[PDB]
Every structure is written in structure tokens, then in C-alpha cells.
XYZ file of N, CA and C in Angstrom:
816
model
N 113.366 -17.221 -92.341
C 113.671 -17.810 -93.614
C 114.477 -19.207 -93.103
N 113.869 -20.248 -93.535
C 114.221 -21.637 -93.164
C 113.958 -22.559 -94.322
N 114.546 -23.367 -94.825
C 114.371 -24.525 -95.779
C 115.056 -25.799 -95.362
N 114.492 -26.504 -94.482
C 114.955 -27.780 -94.056
C 115.101 -28.852 -95.180
N 116.425 -29.201 -95.438
C 116.762 -30.256 -96.583
C 116.782 -31.673 -95.857
N 115.993 -32.723 -96.642
C 116.467 -33.828 -96.304
C 117.516 -34.566 -97.265
N 117.980 -35.404 -97.125
C 119.061 -36.109 -97.910
C 118.542 -36.073 -99.546
N 117.508 -36.681 -99.812
C 117.381 -36.420 -101.078
C 116.725 -35.129 -101.770
N 116.300 -34.216 -100.936
C 115.991 -33.098 -101.656
C 117.423 -32.225 -101.546
N 118.273 -32.535 -100.720
C 119.515 -31.996 -100.598
C 120.269 -31.993 -101.861
N 120.418 -33.296 -102.318
C 121.100 -33.757 -103.683
C 120.400 -33.061 -104.846
N 119.130 -32.959 -105.047
C 118.483 -32.433 -106.066
C 118.415 -30.682 -105.887
N 118.505 -30.169 -104.879
C 118.422 -28.829 -104.654
C 119.889 -28.277 -105.189
N 120.876 -28.830 -104.866
C 122.235 -28.360 -105.061
C 122.489 -28.534 -106.876
N 121.737 -29.217 -107.414
C 121.588 -29.027 -108.886
C 120.475 -28.279 -109.300
N 119.998 -27.678 -108.825
C 119.013 -26.392 -109.500
C 119.241 -25.025 -109.186
N 120.160 -24.709 -109.916
C 120.476 -23.218 -110.158
C 119.506 -22.265 -109.957
N 118.457 -22.548 -110.773
C 117.159 -21.755 -110.910
C 116.613 -21.659 -109.714
N 116.320 -22.690 -108.898
C 115.870 -22.685 -107.589
C 116.678 -21.669 -106.339
N 118.015 -22.245 -106.555
C 119.107 -21.588 -105.825
C 119.089 -19.975 -105.822
N 119.042 -19.470 -107.179
C 119.262 -18.430 -107.230
C 117.862 -17.437 -106.675
N 116.975 -17.914 -106.895
C 115.599 -17.490 -106.561
C 115.439 -17.372 -104.968
N 116.317 -18.309 -104.156
C 116.134 -18.225 -102.727
C 117.225 -17.645 -102.408
N 118.406 -17.400 -102.934
C 119.615 -16.941 -102.362
C 119.042 -15.298 -102.487
N 118.652 -14.708 -103.698
C 118.494 -13.422 -103.901
C 117.358 -12.694 -102.900
N 116.792 -13.585 -102.422
C 115.611 -13.188 -101.597
C 116.240 -12.651 -100.078
N 117.501 -13.309 -99.575
C 118.154 -13.024 -98.530
C 118.582 -11.703 -98.301
N 118.349 -10.889 -97.367
C 118.777 -9.530 -97.151
C 120.274 -9.435 -97.048
N 121.012 -8.819 -97.829
C 122.472 -8.774 -97.528
C 122.915 -8.159 -96.146
N 122.083 -7.315 -95.484
C 122.390 -6.914 -94.231
C 123.550 -5.962 -94.142
N 123.908 -5.393 -95.274
C 125.104 -4.450 -95.003
C 124.968 -3.155 -94.135
N 125.974 -2.786 -93.694
C 126.103 -1.554 -92.746
C 126.051 -0.467 -93.530
N 125.067 0.655 -92.945
C 125.174 1.984 -93.573
C 126.460 2.614 -93.053
N 127.187 3.218 -94.108
C 128.508 3.787 -93.591
C 128.201 5.037 -92.640
N 127.073 5.691 -92.502
C 126.803 6.734 -91.543
C 126.826 6.171 -90.151
N 126.681 4.948 -90.003
C 126.835 4.161 -88.735
C 127.926 4.656 -87.976
N 128.985 4.818 -88.996
C 130.698 4.824 -88.389
C 130.760 6.208 -88.813
N 131.131 7.136 -87.579
C 131.690 8.576 -87.789
C 132.983 8.628 -87.110
N 134.150 8.114 -87.931
C 135.528 8.194 -87.084
C 136.371 8.642 -88.432
N 137.008 9.843 -88.118
C 138.113 10.195 -89.139
C 139.022 9.355 -89.304
N 139.357 9.116 -90.403
C 140.324 8.215 -90.743
C 139.880 6.728 -90.640
N 138.737 6.517 -90.723
C 138.252 4.896 -90.845
C 138.700 4.235 -92.107
N 138.357 4.674 -93.356
C 138.789 4.391 -94.551
C 140.068 3.779 -94.699
N 140.925 4.331 -93.724
C 142.295 3.656 -93.831
C 142.245 2.440 -93.460
N 141.416 1.851 -92.422
C 141.327 0.813 -91.985
C 140.568 -0.273 -92.635
N 139.893 -0.013 -93.717
C 138.795 -0.780 -94.551
C 139.160 -1.167 -95.887
N 139.365 -2.214 -96.097
C 139.788 -2.743 -97.666
C 138.724 -2.212 -98.534
N 137.493 -2.367 -98.161
C 136.330 -1.714 -98.972
C 135.576 -0.797 -98.381
N 135.279 0.566 -98.819
C 134.698 1.435 -97.793
C 133.255 1.037 -97.579
N 132.586 0.262 -98.539
C 131.304 -0.248 -97.994
C 130.972 -1.687 -97.554
N 132.161 -2.139 -97.213
C 132.036 -3.455 -96.392
C 132.467 -3.207 -95.299
N 131.473 -2.988 -94.080
C 131.686 -2.413 -92.866
C 131.207 -3.721 -91.654
N 132.051 -3.446 -90.539
C 131.375 -4.509 -89.658
C 130.092 -4.083 -88.909
N 129.273 -5.137 -88.950
C 127.905 -4.557 -88.173
C 128.375 -4.290 -86.492
N 127.784 -3.288 -86.256
C 128.226 -2.679 -84.983
C 128.152 -3.767 -83.507
N 126.904 -4.416 -83.457
C 126.495 -5.217 -82.390
C 127.570 -6.445 -82.295
N 128.113 -6.737 -83.312
C 129.037 -7.909 -83.345
C 130.414 -7.639 -83.737
N 130.790 -6.474 -83.914
C 132.305 -6.073 -83.928
C 133.175 -6.369 -83.035
N 134.496 -6.745 -83.437
C 135.450 -6.949 -82.369
C 136.198 -5.848 -82.170
N 135.915 -5.428 -80.931
C 136.304 -4.324 -80.449
C 137.751 -4.414 -79.736
N 138.757 -3.643 -80.077
C 140.216 -4.002 -79.884
C 140.835 -3.118 -78.432
N 141.411 -3.634 -77.672
C 141.724 -2.923 -76.379
C 143.106 -2.048 -76.772
N 140.579 6.161 -77.779
C 140.776 6.164 -79.223
C 139.716 5.493 -80.134
N 138.960 5.809 -80.682
C 137.772 5.036 -81.439
C 138.304 4.451 -82.661
N 139.410 4.896 -83.033
C 139.934 4.460 -84.284
C 140.998 3.234 -83.888
N 141.714 3.527 -82.695
C 142.626 2.460 -82.358
C 141.936 1.096 -81.693
N 140.568 1.311 -81.444
C 139.898 0.187 -81.115
C 139.181 -0.743 -82.433
N 139.290 -0.016 -83.256
C 138.474 -0.584 -84.714
C 139.441 -1.441 -85.420
N 138.769 -2.620 -85.641
C 139.029 -3.420 -86.637
C 137.991 -3.924 -87.587
N 137.929 -4.277 -88.904
C 136.933 -4.798 -89.627
C 136.826 -6.285 -89.494
N 136.262 -6.584 -88.244
C 135.897 -8.129 -88.010
C 134.780 -8.204 -87.121
N 134.202 -9.272 -87.177
C 132.729 -9.845 -86.385
C 132.777 -11.079 -85.866
N 132.295 -11.171 -84.563
C 131.965 -12.378 -83.861
C 130.868 -12.886 -84.849
N 131.135 -14.332 -84.965
C 130.068 -15.302 -86.032
C 129.597 -16.147 -84.889
N 128.521 -16.441 -84.744
C 127.882 -17.429 -84.058
C 128.035 -18.666 -84.744
N 128.166 -19.911 -83.942
C 128.274 -21.208 -84.549
C 127.081 -21.787 -84.855
N 126.839 -23.208 -84.888
C 125.684 -24.052 -84.789
C 125.056 -23.767 -83.655
N 123.621 -23.924 -83.702
C 123.002 -23.640 -82.331
C 123.024 -22.359 -81.749
N 123.687 -21.368 -82.579
C 123.556 -20.146 -81.956
C 124.823 -19.864 -80.875
N 125.605 -20.725 -80.630
C 126.797 -20.687 -79.880
C 127.547 -19.343 -80.361
N 127.720 -18.412 -79.226
C 128.260 -17.176 -79.210
C 130.021 -17.316 -79.773
N 130.377 -16.500 -80.483
C 131.762 -16.158 -80.820
C 132.467 -17.588 -81.073
N 132.114 -18.434 -81.875
C 132.803 -19.542 -82.480
C 133.756 -19.166 -83.392
N 133.344 -18.159 -84.205
C 134.308 -17.849 -85.507
C 134.627 -15.981 -85.420
N 135.502 -15.476 -85.903
C 135.718 -14.176 -86.208
C 136.080 -14.218 -87.776
N 135.040 -13.703 -88.398
C 134.918 -13.340 -89.966
C 135.837 -11.786 -90.150
N 137.035 -11.595 -90.857
C 137.579 -10.528 -90.852
C 138.064 -10.483 -92.341
N 138.274 -8.759 -92.691
C 139.074 -8.897 -94.277
C 140.458 -9.475 -94.113
N 141.140 -9.621 -94.949
C 142.264 -9.789 -95.127
C 143.136 -8.337 -94.792
N 144.045 -8.802 -93.871
C 144.893 -7.546 -93.321
C 145.439 -6.654 -94.246
N 145.593 -5.407 -94.228
C 146.041 -4.603 -95.260
C 147.381 -4.056 -94.329
N 148.176 -3.321 -95.407
C 149.374 -2.908 -94.588
C 149.371 -2.171 -93.369
N 148.303 -1.331 -93.281
C 148.025 -0.371 -92.198
C 147.321 -1.126 -91.180
N 146.863 -2.464 -91.122
C 146.026 -3.050 -90.324
C 146.641 -4.393 -89.725
N 147.725 -4.731 -90.305
C 148.652 -6.057 -90.016
C 148.915 -6.370 -88.487
N 149.304 -5.036 -87.840
C 149.476 -4.962 -86.437
C 148.108 -5.357 -85.764
N 146.794 -4.395 -86.025
C 145.829 -4.952 -85.508
C 145.270 -6.035 -85.468
N 145.353 -6.876 -86.735
C 144.939 -8.140 -86.731
C 145.912 -8.987 -85.750
N 147.155 -8.791 -85.506
C 147.923 -9.719 -84.425
C 147.357 -9.536 -83.146
N 147.129 -7.926 -82.801
C 146.558 -7.806 -81.648
C 145.354 -8.583 -81.501
N 144.712 -8.503 -82.312
C 143.292 -9.237 -82.263
C 143.480 -10.742 -81.765
N 144.276 -11.600 -82.686
C 144.776 -12.698 -82.561
C 145.077 -13.087 -80.860
N 146.004 -12.348 -80.389
C 146.606 -12.377 -79.013
C 145.305 -11.801 -78.101
N 144.536 -10.964 -78.496
C 143.405 -10.299 -77.473
C 142.194 -11.657 -77.424
N 142.273 -12.320 -78.414
C 140.853 -13.305 -78.373
C 141.496 -14.618 -78.021
N 142.763 -14.991 -77.948
C 143.274 -16.354 -77.704
C 142.965 -17.241 -78.948
N 142.977 -16.423 -80.204
C 142.654 -17.361 -81.191
C 143.753 -18.749 -81.409
N 143.189 -19.646 -81.675
C 143.908 -21.024 -81.645
C 144.046 -21.371 -83.239
N 143.311 -20.824 -84.067
C 143.450 -21.118 -85.449
C 143.003 -19.795 -86.248
N 143.657 -19.977 -87.498
C 143.489 -19.048 -88.371
C 143.050 -19.857 -89.923
N 142.307 -19.436 -90.422
C 141.925 -20.207 -91.943
C 142.002 -19.070 -92.961
N 142.786 -19.240 -93.739
C 142.942 -18.273 -94.952
C 142.562 -19.177 -96.451
N 141.639 -18.389 -96.875
C 141.095 -19.300 -98.011
C 141.697 -18.447 -99.307
N 142.332 -19.188 -100.191
C 142.899 -18.562 -101.389
C 142.872 -19.459 -102.509
N 142.872 -19.158 -103.730
C 143.100 -19.908 -104.980
C 144.575 -19.781 -105.545
N 145.356 -21.039 -105.818
C 146.731 -20.837 -106.079
C 146.788 -20.734 -107.703
N 145.618 -21.347 -108.403
C 145.526 -21.254 -109.676
C 145.729 -19.814 -110.574
N 145.196 -18.874 -109.410
C 145.104 -17.457 -109.782
C 145.254 -16.620 -108.568
N 145.314 -13.848 -100.596
C 144.566 -12.625 -100.380
C 145.173 -11.610 -99.432
N 146.356 -11.939 -99.196
C 147.231 -11.078 -98.151
C 148.475 -11.315 -98.150
N 149.344 -10.751 -97.170
C 150.694 -11.099 -97.043
C 151.027 -10.525 -95.211
N 151.064 -11.333 -94.314
C 151.133 -10.694 -93.037
C 152.088 -11.834 -92.118
N 152.161 -13.104 -92.764
C 152.909 -13.950 -91.745
C 154.315 -14.021 -92.191
N 155.093 -14.355 -91.212
C 156.826 -13.834 -91.342
C 157.352 -15.278 -91.932
N 158.475 -14.996 -92.465
C 159.436 -16.021 -92.952
C 159.854 -16.824 -91.639
N 160.450 -16.178 -90.963
C 160.968 -16.743 -89.538
C 160.412 -15.992 -88.160
N 160.518 -14.879 -88.226
C 160.204 -13.844 -86.890
C 159.729 -12.627 -87.400
N 158.547 -12.135 -86.993
C 158.421 -10.621 -86.897
C 157.675 -10.275 -85.774
N 157.590 -9.021 -85.264
C 156.966 -8.751 -84.373
C 156.000 -7.413 -84.522
N 154.668 -7.593 -84.010
C 153.878 -6.435 -84.055
C 153.310 -6.051 -82.493
N 153.131 -4.600 -82.244
C 152.358 -4.209 -81.008
C 152.768 -4.918 -80.003
N 153.697 -5.805 -79.638
C 154.138 -6.563 -78.653
C 153.853 -8.013 -78.632
N 153.786 -8.451 -79.955
C 153.499 -10.005 -80.076
C 154.525 -10.415 -81.444
N 155.373 -11.566 -80.732
C 156.490 -12.208 -81.694
C 155.979 -13.413 -82.227
N 155.884 -13.247 -83.640
C 155.234 -14.399 -84.467
C 156.415 -15.237 -84.969
N 156.454 -16.458 -84.530
C 157.394 -17.463 -85.252
C 156.926 -18.743 -85.813
N 156.991 -18.916 -87.241
C 156.609 -19.894 -88.071
C 157.741 -21.057 -87.535
N 157.162 -22.009 -86.804
C 158.182 -23.183 -86.282
C 157.945 -24.370 -87.244
N 157.140 -24.534 -87.868
C 156.720 -25.584 -88.885
C 155.917 -25.235 -90.052
N 155.974 -26.129 -91.105
C 155.231 -25.971 -92.072
C 155.020 -27.465 -92.785
N 153.799 -27.700 -93.162
C 153.265 -29.113 -93.261
C 152.441 -28.722 -94.717
N 152.805 -29.058 -95.820
C 152.242 -28.883 -97.230
C 151.428 -30.237 -97.368
N 150.052 -30.137 -97.577
C 149.053 -30.943 -98.092
C 148.697 -30.601 -99.482
N 147.910 -31.641 -100.287
C 147.397 -31.229 -101.420
C 146.187 -30.226 -101.582
N 145.423 -30.072 -100.385
C 144.621 -29.054 -100.242
C 145.018 -27.710 -99.402
N 146.017 -27.882 -98.757
C 146.064 -26.586 -97.577
C 147.680 -26.693 -97.191
N 148.131 -25.553 -96.700
C 149.771 -25.516 -96.153
C 149.414 -25.281 -94.432
N 149.914 -25.998 -93.634
C 149.455 -25.747 -92.438
C 150.746 -25.337 -91.627
N 150.681 -24.057 -91.022
C 152.060 -23.604 -90.367
C 151.499 -23.577 -88.867
N 152.508 -24.191 -88.152
C 152.560 -24.387 -86.728
C 153.426 -22.997 -86.119
N 152.793 -22.131 -85.470
C 153.420 -20.886 -85.122
C 153.355 -20.845 -83.768
N 154.250 -20.081 -83.295
C 154.372 -19.545 -81.944
C 154.199 -18.331 -81.623
N 153.416 -18.017 -80.725
C 153.001 -16.577 -80.396
C 153.551 -16.300 -79.017
N 154.764 -15.230 -78.838
C 155.384 -14.804 -77.673
C 155.016 -12.941 -77.559
N 154.408 -13.066 -76.434
C 154.204 -11.559 -75.878
C 154.631 -11.302 -74.509
N 155.902 -11.299 -74.228
C 156.089 -11.214 -72.668
C 156.586 -12.523 -72.340
N 156.177 -13.071 -70.930
C 156.516 -14.279 -70.369
C 155.552 -15.328 -70.886
N 154.432 -14.953 -71.633
C 153.626 -15.908 -72.035
C 153.780 -16.398 -73.402
N 153.497 -17.550 -73.588
C 153.758 -18.056 -74.931
C 152.455 -18.882 -75.462
N 151.801 -18.705 -76.750
C 150.743 -19.549 -77.182
C 151.054 -20.099 -78.592
N 150.361 -21.308 -78.785
C 150.700 -21.843 -79.945
C 149.200 -21.420 -80.821
N 149.571 -21.618 -82.253
C 148.621 -21.141 -83.098
C 148.702 -21.877 -84.723
N 147.715 -22.293 -84.965
C 147.617 -23.370 -86.368
C 147.365 -22.290 -87.429
N 147.956 -22.196 -88.320
C 147.427 -21.368 -89.565
C 147.260 -22.257 -90.811
N 146.045 -22.444 -91.207
C 145.643 -23.030 -92.442
C 145.575 -22.142 -93.574
N 146.318 -22.325 -94.625
C 146.558 -21.704 -95.790
C 145.758 -22.768 -97.075
N 144.606 -22.533 -97.084
C 144.059 -23.457 -98.089
C 143.941 -22.738 -99.577
N 144.384 -23.345 -100.552
C 145.102 -23.061 -101.676
C 143.971 -23.481 -102.756
N 143.132 -24.135 -102.747
C 142.398 -24.685 -103.802
C 140.883 -24.164 -103.689
N 140.793 -22.903 -103.726
C 139.484 -22.483 -103.567
C 139.155 -22.222 -105.200
N 138.103 -23.062 -105.671
C 138.271 -22.951 -107.490
C 137.419 -21.610 -107.806
N 137.705 -21.437 -108.989
C 137.117 -20.619 -110.168
C 135.785 -21.058 -110.495
N 135.575 -22.376 -110.774
C 134.148 -22.854 -110.871
C 133.909 -23.854 -110.005
N 132.733 -23.425 -109.130
C 132.501 -24.032 -108.158
C 131.330 -25.204 -108.352
N 131.935 -25.990 -108.967
C 131.475 -27.249 -109.373
C 131.640 -28.595 -108.476
N 130.768 -29.582 -108.589
C 131.226 -30.620 -107.488
C 132.148 -31.156 -107.309
N 133.106 -31.351 -108.413
C 134.450 -31.921 -108.154
C 135.290 -31.134 -107.676
N 135.231 -29.954 -107.321
C 135.892 -28.980 -106.558
C 135.500 -29.178 -104.960
N 134.682 -29.806 -104.638
C 134.165 -29.792 -103.378
C 135.029 -30.519 -102.165
N 135.413 -31.571 -102.659
C 136.126 -32.340 -101.626
C 137.049 -31.747 -100.904
N 137.821 -30.882 -101.391
C 139.019 -30.233 -100.552
C 138.371 -29.175 -99.526
N 137.409 -28.624 -99.736
C 136.948 -27.540 -98.763
C 136.129 -28.504 -97.898
N 135.564 -29.675 -98.167
C 135.140 -30.656 -96.905
C 136.111 -30.996 -96.050
N 137.480 -31.287 -96.514
C 138.331 -31.850 -95.933
C 138.728 -30.926 -94.842
N 139.123 -29.566 -95.585
C 139.473 -28.654 -94.653
C 138.659 -28.112 -93.542
N 137.222 -28.525 -93.840
C 136.168 -27.882 -92.826
C 136.449 -28.947 -91.726
N 136.730 -30.313 -92.069
C 136.899 -31.282 -91.029
C 138.152 -31.413 -90.094
N 139.146 -30.995 -90.929
C 140.308 -30.986 -90.220
C 140.367 -29.728 -89.248
N 139.887 -28.541 -89.522
C 139.657 -27.477 -88.825
C 138.847 -27.886 -87.561
N 137.731 -28.344 -87.660
C 136.709 -28.689 -86.568
C 137.465 -29.669 -85.546
N 137.910 -30.571 -86.030
C 138.882 -31.580 -85.194
C 140.046 -30.700 -84.638
N 140.906 -30.036 -85.303
C 141.803 -29.175 -84.522
C 141.274 -28.455 -83.319
N 140.009 -27.489 -83.675
C 139.305 -26.862 -82.744
C 138.922 -27.836 -81.496
N 138.470 -28.865 -81.664
C 138.133 -29.677 -80.554
C 139.020 -30.179 -79.849
N 140.454 -30.186 -80.215
C 141.641 -30.346 -79.518
C 141.949 -29.347 -78.320
N 141.260 -27.994 -78.658
C 141.619 -27.015 -77.625
C 140.903 -27.024 -76.435
N 139.913 -28.002 -76.370
C 139.320 -28.264 -75.349
C 137.936 -27.167 -74.811
N 137.698 -27.332 -73.811
C 136.377 -26.265 -73.392
C 137.204 -24.597 -73.344
N 136.960 -23.663 -74.298
C 137.801 -22.570 -74.112
C 137.060 -21.705 -75.115
N 136.650 -20.548 -74.662
C 136.064 -19.330 -75.901
C 137.155 -18.722 -76.720
N 137.512 -19.575 -77.711
C 138.714 -19.237 -78.357
C 138.318 -19.054 -79.934
N 137.723 -18.151 -80.383
C 137.222 -18.030 -81.703
C 138.269 -18.388 -82.533
N 137.714 -18.985 -83.831
C 138.525 -19.312 -84.878
C 138.454 -18.036 -86.141
N 139.558 -17.514 -86.549
C 139.367 -16.450 -87.568
C 139.478 -17.186 -88.938
N 138.672 -16.379 -89.782
C 138.493 -16.948 -91.129
C 138.618 -15.645 -92.046
N 139.323 -15.587 -92.886
C 139.333 -14.614 -93.955
C 139.836 -14.835 -95.386
N 139.598 -14.074 -96.340
C 140.574 -14.023 -97.621
C 140.655 -12.527 -97.695
N 139.870 -11.860 -98.691
C 139.980 -10.613 -98.959
C 138.839 -9.620 -98.177
N 137.649 -9.673 -98.214
C 136.887 -8.819 -97.783
C 136.224 -9.560 -96.548
N 136.321 -10.823 -96.222
C 135.839 -11.548 -95.034
C 134.272 -11.972 -95.160
N 133.842 -11.895 -96.308
C 132.336 -12.344 -96.297
C 131.941 -13.347 -97.420
N 132.608 -13.619 -98.141
C 132.172 -14.353 -99.408
C 132.732 -15.896 -99.439
N 134.116 -16.135 -99.561
C 134.642 -17.362 -99.160
C 134.530 -17.555 -97.707
N 134.829 -16.579 -96.967
C 134.736 -16.851 -95.765
C 133.348 -17.233 -95.121
N 132.350 -16.804 -95.645
C 130.845 -17.194 -95.279
C 130.654 -18.702 -95.696
N 131.140 -19.069 -97.062
C 131.093 -20.438 -97.133
C 131.648 -21.190 -96.473
N 132.783 -20.956 -96.019
C 133.387 -22.000 -95.111
C 132.728 -22.194 -93.687
N 132.378 -20.807 -93.212
C 131.655 -20.988 -92.056
C 130.254 -21.623 -92.009
N 129.608 -21.355 -93.149
C 128.284 -22.002 -93.374
C 128.550 -23.683 -93.516
N 129.281 -24.097 -94.127
C 129.681 -25.466 -94.316
C 130.141 -26.250 -92.962
N 130.826 -25.443 -92.147
C 131.030 -25.801 -90.797
C 130.060 -26.148 -89.934
N 129.043 -25.275 -90.047
C 127.744 -25.220 -89.115
C 127.071 -26.306 -89.583
N 126.847 -26.393 -91.006
C 125.817 -27.371 -91.596
C 126.453 -28.847 -91.463
N 127.630 -28.816 -91.571
C 128.102 -30.138 -91.129
C 128.047 -30.502 -89.718
N 127.778 -29.923 -88.669
C 127.477 -30.183 -87.521
C 125.893 -30.442 -87.531
N 125.143 -29.420 -88.113
C 123.704 -29.819 -88.366
C 123.522 -30.998 -88.780
N 124.021 -31.473 -90.033
C 123.687 -32.737 -90.608
C 124.206 -34.009 -89.750
N 125.088 -33.878 -88.940
C 125.558 -34.959 -88.135
C 124.483 -35.136 -86.890
N 124.137 -34.044 -86.445
C 123.326 -33.976 -85.216
C 121.709 -34.166 -85.352
N 121.396 -33.586 -86.517
C 119.957 -33.650 -86.756
C 119.711 -34.307 -87.984
N 120.405 -34.927 -88.790
C 120.226 -35.794 -90.069
C 119.637 -34.661 -91.220
N 119.734 -33.432 -90.922
C 119.139 -32.466 -92.205
C 120.255 -31.415 -92.215
N 120.043 -30.548 -93.248
C 120.656 -29.316 -93.410
C 119.602 -28.145 -93.663
N 119.758 -26.951 -93.222
C 119.035 -25.723 -93.446
C 120.381 -24.528 -93.971
N 120.405 -24.673 -94.989
C 121.431 -23.767 -95.553
C 120.791 -22.358 -95.522
N 119.595 -22.187 -95.922
C 118.921 -21.024 -95.858
C 119.130 -20.320 -94.715
N 118.693 -21.028 -93.555
C 118.482 -20.443 -92.103
C 120.017 -20.068 -91.766
N 120.867 -20.880 -91.852
C 122.329 -20.685 -91.537
C 122.810 -19.620 -92.286
N 122.627 -19.152 -93.571
C 123.079 -18.201 -94.456
C 122.280 -16.912 -93.709
N 120.851 -16.812 -93.424
C 120.329 -15.752 -92.592
C 121.000 -15.484 -91.338
N 121.342 -16.650 -90.607
C 122.172 -16.061 -89.075
C 123.471 -15.703 -89.589
N 124.159 -16.207 -90.214
C 125.567 -15.510 -90.678
C 125.316 -14.054 -91.170
N 124.493 -13.568 -91.868
C 124.067 -12.200 -92.438
C 123.738 -11.401 -91.029
N 122.985 -11.965 -90.238
C 122.678 -11.339 -88.836
C 123.958 -10.776 -88.288
N 125.086 -11.596 -88.290
C 126.333 -11.308 -87.585
C 127.225 -10.455 -88.364
N 127.352 -10.547 -89.650
C 128.186 -9.939 -90.574
C 127.291 -9.587 -92.090
N 127.396 -8.505 -92.258
C 126.412 -8.342 -93.776
C 127.217 -8.693 -94.758
N 126.687 -9.623 -95.687
C 127.158 -10.080 -96.970
C 127.554 -11.466 -96.971
N 127.983 -12.006 -95.749
C 128.200 -13.402 -95.824
C 127.591 -14.076 -96.781
N 128.388 -14.899 -97.435
C 128.193 -15.638 -98.899
C 127.813 -14.787 -99.840
N 128.456 -14.177 -100.708
C 128.257 -13.016 -101.602
C 127.687 -13.365 -102.889
N 127.607 -14.499 -103.446
C 127.286 -14.994 -104.740
C 126.733 -16.088 -104.810
N 125.634 -16.138 -105.860
C 124.841 -17.302 -105.837
C 125.917 -18.654 -106.116
N 126.895 -18.628 -106.872
C 127.556 -19.538 -106.964
C 128.295 -20.170 -105.927
N 128.606 -19.392 -104.701
C 129.201 -19.643 -103.506
C 128.000 -20.327 -102.664
N 126.927 -19.988 -102.746
C 125.585 -20.523 -102.108
C 125.432 -21.738 -102.729
N 125.673 -22.067 -103.736
C 125.503 -23.329 -104.920
C 126.680 -24.376 -104.254
N 127.993 -23.585 -104.054
C 128.748 -24.424 -103.365
C 128.830 -25.228 -102.329
N 128.009 -24.383 -101.338
C 127.790 -24.940 -100.247
C 126.874 -26.126 -100.123
N 126.182 -25.994 -100.963
C 124.856 -27.049 -101.319
C 125.915 -28.331 -101.934
N 126.897 -28.075 -102.921
C 127.537 -29.293 -103.214
C 128.329 -29.971 -102.448
N 128.962 -28.976 -101.208
C 129.714 -29.545 -100.319
C 128.943 -30.576 -99.289
N 127.615 -30.015 -98.949
C 127.059 -30.766 -98.427
C 126.048 -31.796 -98.479
N 125.974 -31.703 -100.086
C 125.503 -32.902 -100.677
C 126.587 -34.104 -100.452
N 127.813 -33.654 -101.029
C 128.803 -34.534 -100.962
C 129.083 -35.349 -99.446
N 128.926 -34.492 -98.576
C 129.260 -34.997 -97.032
C 128.038 -36.198 -96.768
N 126.908 -35.719 -97.078
C 125.760 -36.444 -96.675
C 125.787 -38.082 -97.512
N 126.354 -38.130 -98.709
C 126.556 -39.157 -99.444
C 127.569 -40.104 -98.293
N 128.780 -39.089 -97.906
C 129.748 -39.972 -97.452
C 129.068 -40.478 -95.966
N 128.250 -39.894 -95.321
C 127.904 -40.182 -94.036
C 126.861 -41.228 -94.354
N 126.351 -41.547 -95.194
C 125.477 -42.677 -95.789
C 126.309 -43.930 -96.293
N 127.313 -43.893 -96.607
C 128.157 -44.886 -97.107
C 129.519 -45.172 -96.097
């Protein structure tokens, strides 16, 4: 499943919703059959009983229930392993598991994708601790597109930095005029990620279920690298690769079209 798009075809493709829905609904969701998991009490760890992590790519935490989190490693451009972790928005019973993941994985960046005009609560006012991890919001930076929290993680003698991006402009209508802020976020996060240097440090992305908006953000990030390196984008193949890693990535046709609007916008920016 591949449809390589040149500049001119990308601009027209983004504006053809009939072709987009034809292509998008041909892509298998690759959801996990719940029988795959036979763990009593697992449904307490899942925000949706049918949105489960594919086993081959699931993030295993350091008792089968205590090692479980609804989260998957996602490959990046070129198939690079563990560039991202896509995860559900933490629930009350998983907030501690979430921060254990952040520390265990050495995650330097969290990206939370919400709409302020209308996904969870787990970051502290000043300080809170979970399973031996002290979170400290040290600074807050408000922009038009997102709020950036600079966070200090302290678990014993060791201290780590963390950047939490709270995107607030996820649109109800996925029209081209709502694309620039997503593209800005993607570009800011990949520059911040490059400042971490050579290090296997997955970027955590989430909202509610960890597949829809999360898949748009990761697919856009991947295709931006593809456009810069190859001069083309293959959103179909990228979406296929994402679904291999986590079932359901990019849930709706309007989300799929939105990636096309964002990439069409970016290609114009790169030509000018």
C-alpha cells in the first residue's frame, strides 16, 4: 500500500475527499482481538475495552498486570525503531504507570493534543510524586498554538529534564486554514528532539485513545522528513506503517485529509 505524491498531485489530492475516503477505508485498522490479552483486571487499565496495544510493539513496564500499559512503540521515518510512543491519555488508575513509562524510557518530550474551543489531567501544579518519580513544573511558556511546560523529573540522586507540549488548537473542522498550527508544532517538536543528540529516547504522544489525533501528529512528522529528504510524500504507506505498530492510527477520513492539508501547506512553504 503506497501512493507516492509529487508536489502537484499532493495539492490536488488534499482537495479530493472522494479519492481520500476511497483510499483511506481500504487500509485495514489492524485492531487487536481482545482474546490476545487474558489478564484479569486489564479493563481497569484501558480507557476503551476495544482499543488495545498490539503485542509485538507494546511498551512493557518493569505480575502481568503491573507490566501492562496501553502504549506502543512507533517507528519513525525510514523504519527507525522506537522514535515515538503512542499511548492513551492516562486515567486515574494509570497515571502512575504513565510516569513510570516516562522515566523508564528516558522520554524527553511529551506531546498532548487537545482542542481548547471544546484529554486528561496528570501534570502537577507545582510538585507531585508517583512510584518514585517527583515531577516538578519548573516553567510555563504560552504560545498561540501550544503551552510548553519545562519539567524536572527527580527519582533518587538522578534528575532529568522533560518538555511537555500542550497543543490547544486541534480543530473541530479539519480545513486548510487550521493546518499551520499543527505544522508549527511538528516542526518545533522535531527541532527539540534533535537537541537531545544521539539517544534512544522515544517521544510520547497522546490525547484520549492514542490513535486518532496521535496518528495525525506522528504521520505528519514522518512525512515532513520524507518530503525534505525525498522531495515526495507517501501518506498511504506511512499510515500503513503506523497501523502495523498500533491498530487504528489515524481513525477518521477527516484526520487523513488533514495530514494531506498539512503536507500540502508544508510543500508550498518549502518551494517558497
